[PDB]
């Protein structure tokens, strides 16, 4: 099995540099090329460059020439990309792609989220959303979780540690005053809540935060 | 540098219906030496990485269902889905490999389903948020179709539009519906000075709007 | 003297055949009688060891009795005046004479193999000398590989210098009157140059493998100096491992036979009762087959790294090192293949000779030819493969 593990999310100050990684496993590291793709909502998928791990020769796009620097290590089978002179335009989702010799096959990583801003990290404020005590008479019930005032993206939210997935809607966070606001809703049968406990689990890696908030009646 | 441009940008279709996507390149992608048009089609589902479907612009990768069929030559290519299924909800890109590399703008595929009335729920501010000094009434609108919907807030009957944060979602893979979050954020005092709060939803599945209200002096 | 009397007889019979007057036939017949009896008194070289009363001598003299009798009859017929009859008696005289002349006094394949070995001798000497001189008088060709190939060129040179005695022994195998020291010497030198060739090819291939796979070679493969040390040690091991030849081969003859007729240059009896023959055959057998394995694996790895499969969509270049490495590795690959292919029947035949020494033609001949065909073919392959070599040769000559 071929698997690529990239680095975690980055919050880099504007003007500084960063170096992302891409750990390749499951094939001969020197046989397959290593490419890098930058994904932005405005420009879409942009091809940064590529590198041959056996010879070390690289090739860049004319736009990302000088901005990015692709390297590779064979003893650790890991590729790297150094981004210098970072600005807000560099905040994006970066992928590494190992291109198999068979042109039908290629392998993508999970992606690295690069956020570049002078705003410092902010842990989220998790607020439980419970029904009004008069709307528990329908065929089902719905609870909520408000992840307000955090920075930067992302946060990973779950319900009952992921054991409650279907009937769950987590919404894209909206940025206001340099603070993200997010929310989630979970629908279960009328017999489930509140006899069985329901908790939303919010994780913010940039601040090393994990708050678990129970949903209890009013 | 080779530039790629796809068409259309957005496309809706029913289940089982045919779909034709187009990918135009600013330069020919035919290598006369290898006699292959280096043009690939990728399917990126939301939250996932792009996966390869068609390489050499006409050859289907092993494992891809035979309904995906790419064709074209030179500067004009197409990806044809003969029987679109709900699992095909994704954005389809096209990557050229004649020169270094270049992706297209992408094509978002949306499937059509039966009209569904939104399930509306309203939630008063929690206690700890009022302890911090703020207030947020959270109104969820779940599992409706189509995407067109409007939301109005009514405090004591008076409409409220400033101080509202909305968040739409993409189409679900399970039932092909949509969802929307609408949070009205007020101060603690202004929250504790009015009485009734109303989340009103206007959707084409019902002539009368679907309302959900609550009072502070109850429960 | 027998030769003088015989030339006298042929001369006077020549006169009789071209004599018109009967007097000329009379004189020539008289002198033929005199030289015939004088020749009969003389002892032939083939019957000097036998006693005078031996039967062979009595036959040799009996033929002379018949001869002089015919001379008497012809002399009578000439005294009569019948020239034709005396000339006919001289004709039958010539018949009996010729009969007792011839009585008491592989080849095309040999010409072919010998001529071919001469061709490979000329093209070999000239080719390898041109190789060493090309490496000598040009800066851009004094690389390490060219040094190893120059030592190999000298090894081919010395092998061809050992060819003559090997060919003389190839056809003239019944007598070996050249001596014992030569019989040991030329085979010792030939075997030594064999070992130097194989060890030099192997060392060269090892250096290419380390040079391509381990670019830390800059420290390891230092300069020409390392190559000169490896050449020195290679030739020393070649001379020491081929030393026992001086005990292995020798000149021997049967018991009770004339040594000048039964001397041969072959493994000695002591070299057989003690397995020095089989030991040496296994020594050179390792010296060839083991480096054949090493060359196969090493060039397999070099070809695996240089000629690696690449996705057609590859965007990065070729590094400009694998191009030159592909050139010299192509050349060296063809050279090694020709080496193994040429010297394989040689070692096979030597193995069969060793195994047969404890209880065909074109096989031994084709091994004899191929053995030198390698030494001659290496410079030709240099001329075909390497463009720099061709340019250097044409720059030296024209
Ligand atoms: C024709 C021939 N005659 C031989 C007579 C004796 C003999 O004894 C040996 C000596 C050393 C070793 Br160790 C093993 C032995 F049996 N070997 C040969 C013999 O090999 N050949 C083959 C020729 C082929 C052309 C090159 N030539 C070079 C190599 C002398 C050999």
Numbering used by the authors:
A (entry chain H): 1 to 218
B (entry chain L): 1 to 219
C (entry chain A): 1002 to 1106, 39 to 292, 301 to 339
Sentences from the paper on this structure:
Here, we report the first high-resolution crystal structure of the ghrelin receptor bound to an antagonist. The ghrelin receptor structure, as a class A GPCR, shares a canonical seven-transmembrane helical architecture and an intracellular amphipathic helix 8. In addition, several reports indicated that the ghrelin receptor exhibits strong ligand-independent activity. Moreover, both a Fab fragment antibody (Fab 7881) specific for the ghrelin receptor and an antagonist, Compound 21, were added to bRIL-conjugated truncated ghrelin receptor to increase thermostability.
For crystallization, 28 and 20 residues were removed from the N and C termini of the receptor, respectively, and the thermostabilized apocytochrome b562RIL (bRIL) protein from Escherichia coli was fused to the deleted N terminus. In addition, two mutations were introduced: T1303.39K (superscripts indicate residue numbering using the Ballesteros–Weinstein nomenclature) to improve thermostability and expression, and N188Q in extracellular loop 2 (ECL2) to avoid glycosylation. Thus, Fab 7881 seems to stabilize ICL3 and improve the thermostability of the ghrelin receptor, allowing it to form crystals. The ghrelin receptor was crystallized in lipidic cubic phase and solved at 3.3 Å resolution. The binding pocket of ghrelin receptor is bifurcated into two cavities by a salt bridge between E1243.33 and R2836.55. The crystal structure of ghrelin receptor bound to Compound 21 revealed that the 1-isopropylpiperidine moiety of the Compound 21 sits in cavity I, whereas the 4-bromo-2-fluorobenzene moiety sits in cavity II, and the 5-azaquinazolinone moiety (5-aza core) links between cavities I and II. Moreover, the 5-nitrogen of the 5-aza core forms a hydrogen bond with R2836.55, which connects with E1243.33 through a salt bridge and forms the boundary between the cavities I and II. In addition, the 5-aza core makes a π–cation interaction with R1022.63. The 4-bromo-2-fluorobenzene moiety makes three hydrophobic contacts with residues I1784.60, L1814.63, and M2135.39 in cavity II. We found that the ghrelin receptor has a wide gap (crevasse) between the TM6 and TM7 bundles, which is rich in hydrophobic amino acids including a cluster of phenylalanine residues. Furthermore, the G2826.54 and the bulky side chains of the five phenylalanines (F2796.51, F2866.58, F2906.62, F3097.39, and F3127.42) in TM6 and TM7 are positioned to open the space between the TM6 and TM7 bundles.
